[PDB]
Design a protein around this ligand. Structure first.
Ligand SMILES: [Cl-]
Ligand SMILES: [Cl-]
Ligand SMILES: [Cl-]
Ligand SMILES: [Cl-]
Ligand SMILES: [Cl-]
Ligand SMILES: [Cl-]
Ligand SMILES: [Cl-]
Ligand SMILES: [Cl-]
Length: 226
């Protein structure tokens, strides 16, 4: 609703997780312009810091309410509020690392509330994640489509490395409204996530993300719709 999701919205996030058995907690808050598809966040490691792995595997887990949509693509996730939605993600990294994530999103007292759980496993002890050799995500295209009564997204997601190379992951996410709301058809979401600042050990980190939905069919008529 245009009433309940305002042009500027704040959020609080809590993550509990483990990577290669190393347990941690993160608390953060953020803000942005949901209909414009822009947001920032500041995250703080509150337990298990400093983290012995790349911040970059956590950054994409910290807000799909802030995606710009053409007027004629049902904004399924915005419409799930105030009750909200859940998402479940699997990231298969090319060296056998795996990240599984679950998230609950709701709207409480006019603020989004995000609860995240993360399990990262089988990262090579001397690979770029555990050795902190990553340098942020390339811009991504998430292919969205409805399936089994939920909204699914698939990404071929690419991390830049300090050595000039790259490090890839296959990602699939299911996004499911807690109440029935109309699912969209297939379309793409262009995403760019930046680490804007961090302290030396990444126990305080600031992110920015821009995300915009675009039609993937419909030709010039649907182009730049909205
Ligand atoms: Cl407003
Ligand atoms: Cl506010
Ligand atoms: Cl979306
Ligand atoms: Cl493990
Ligand atoms: Cl390890
Ligand atoms: Cl970055
Ligand atoms: Cl659609
Ligand atoms: Cl478009």
């Amino acid at each position: 609703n245009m009433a309940i999701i305002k042009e500027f919205m704040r959020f609080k996030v809590h993550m509990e997780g483990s990577v290669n058995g190393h347990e941690f907690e993160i608390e953060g808050e953020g803000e942005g312009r949901p209909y414009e598809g822009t947001q920032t966040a500041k995250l703080k490691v509150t337990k298990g810091g400093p983290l012995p792995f790349a911040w970059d595997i956590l950054s994409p887990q910290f807000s799909k309410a802030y995606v710009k949509h053409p007027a004629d693509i049902p904004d399924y996730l915005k419409l799930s509020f105030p009750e909200g939605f859940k998402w479940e993600r699997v990231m298969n990294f090319e060296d056998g690392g795996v990240v599984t994530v679950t998230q609950d999103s709701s709207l409480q007292d006019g603020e989004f509330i995000y609860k995240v759980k993360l399990r990262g496993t089988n990262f090579p002890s001397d690979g770029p994640v555990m050795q902190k050799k990553t340098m942020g995500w390339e811009a991504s295209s998430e292919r969205m489509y409805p399936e089994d009564g939920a909204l699914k997204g698939e990404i071929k997601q690419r991390l830049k490395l300090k050595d000039g190379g790259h490090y890839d992951a296959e990602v699939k996410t299911t996004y499911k409204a807690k109440k029935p709301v109309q699912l969209p058809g297939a379309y793409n979401v262009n995403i760019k996530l930046d680490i804007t600042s961090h302290n030396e050990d990444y126990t305080i980190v600031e992110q920015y993300e821009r995300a915009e939905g675009r039609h993937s069919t419909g030709g010039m008529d649907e182009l730049y719709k909205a």
